[PDB]
Amino acid sequence: MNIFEMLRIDEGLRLKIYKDTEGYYTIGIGHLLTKSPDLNAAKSELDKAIGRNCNGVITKDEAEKLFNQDVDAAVRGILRNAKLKPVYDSLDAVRRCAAINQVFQMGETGVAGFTNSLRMLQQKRWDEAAVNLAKSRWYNQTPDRAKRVITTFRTGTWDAYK
Numbered sequence: 720m721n722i723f724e725m726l727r728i729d730e731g732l733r734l735k736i737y738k739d740t741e742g743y744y745t746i747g748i749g750h751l752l753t754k755s756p757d758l759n760a761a762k763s764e765l766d767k768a769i770g771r772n773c774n775g776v777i778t779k780d781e782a783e784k785l786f787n788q789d790v791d792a793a794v795r796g797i798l799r800n801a802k803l804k805p806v807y808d809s810l811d812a813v814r815r816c817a818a819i820n821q822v823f824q825m826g827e828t829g830v831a832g833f834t835n836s837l838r839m840l841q842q843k844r845w846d847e848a849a850v851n852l853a854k855s856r857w858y859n860q861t862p863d864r865a866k867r868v869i870t871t872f873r874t875g876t877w878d879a880y881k
């Protein structure tokens with residue numbers, strides 16, 4: 720198991736534009752296209768992302784290319800985030816994957832909301848962190864995925880993805 724395999728399980732792979740759990744146009748392996756309700760706007764974003772006129776459909780290789788870019792961007796975003804970087808750097812490799820997963824899904828806008836969870840993670844108070852992480856819109860809206868990610872944060876093992 721590694722971050723790519725983990726996110727591939729959590730995000731799936733679809734080659735046609737679809738709506739994500741939040742109702743937003745997405746393609747590939749969880750590549751968000753836009754929050755616009757206009758499918759044409761999503762198609763424009765797709766064509767821009769791929770560099771050709773796709774009319775809402777891509778290949779597996781193209782999906783994997785977006786996925787590589789998105790994982791890279793998520794990790795690098797963590798390192799550029801003054802709140803996230805020290806916590807991320809404090810973690811072992813498996814728990815780092817949990818952090819990348821959560822950022823991939825949620826982005827960085829809600830970081831301040833996770834101030835207490837982040838502190839508990841940096842303190843290595845794993846059971847306490849796991850309890851706190853579940854007290855969230857994130858958990859309530861995607862509980863099966865959040866349970867897997869939280870188990871990963873709690874244990875530093877891949878048990879939830881076996």
Ligand SMILES: CCO[C@@H]1CCC=CO1
Pocket residue numbers: 803817818821822825826827829830833836837
């Ligand atoms: C989604 C970014 O906020 C943090 C990062 C990983 C752990 C808790 O939430």
